[PDB]
């Protein structure tokens, strides 16, 4: 059964390897601004490498990890923000197109 993304995030953060890789992904594939969803082009390579760095962890893509936001309770908005960082990430989409 597909787990809740926040639960999966917690299982990742307790492992020093996954915690580090996840943090790198959020850092390198973040928007260039609150208004601009894309990152600066100069960061494409680092964003893709960071995204690929998730492979081998519970955050392995297949794209978003294997999780959804069912049963998020009061934390639904946060769960969706997490999930959308994978599914609706302009920086990541552009990086994959550029070097994937």
Domain residue limits at 82: 1-100
What's the length of the chain? 100
Q: Count other C-beta atoms under 10 Å from residue 22's C-beta.
A: 22
Rounded to the nearest 10 degrees, what angle do helices 5-13 and 76-87 cross at? 80
> How was this one solved?
X-ray
C-alpha–C-alpha distance, residues 92 and 83, integer Å: 13
The span from the CA of 44 to the CA of 13, in Å, is 25
Q: At what angle do helices 44-52 and 90-99 cross, to 10 degrees?
A: 90
Spatial distance between the Cα atoms of 60 and 72, rounded to a whole number of angstroms? 21
- Tell me the CA distances in angstroms from 91 to 15, 35, 36, one per residue in order: 26, 13, 10
CATH number assigned to the domain comprising residue 100: 1.10.220.110
Q: How far apart are the first and last CA of the chain?
A: 30
C-alpha 28: how far from chain center: 10
- Number of structural domains the chain divides into: 1
CA 6 to CA 72: how far, in whole Å?
8
């Amino acid at each position: 059964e597909r787990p809740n993304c926040l639960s999966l995030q917690d299982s990742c953060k307790t492992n020093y390897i996954c915690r580090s890789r996840l943090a790198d992904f959020f850092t390198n594939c973040q928007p260039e601004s609150r208004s601009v969803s894309n990152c600066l082009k100069e960061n494409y390579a680092d964003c893709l490498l960071a995204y690929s760095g998730l492979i081998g962890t519970v955050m392995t893509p297949n794209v978003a990890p294997w999780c959804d936001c069912s049963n998020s309770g009061n934390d639904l908005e946060d769960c969706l923000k997490f999930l959308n960082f994978f599914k609706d990430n302009t920086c990541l989409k552009n990086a994959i197109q550029a070097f994937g």
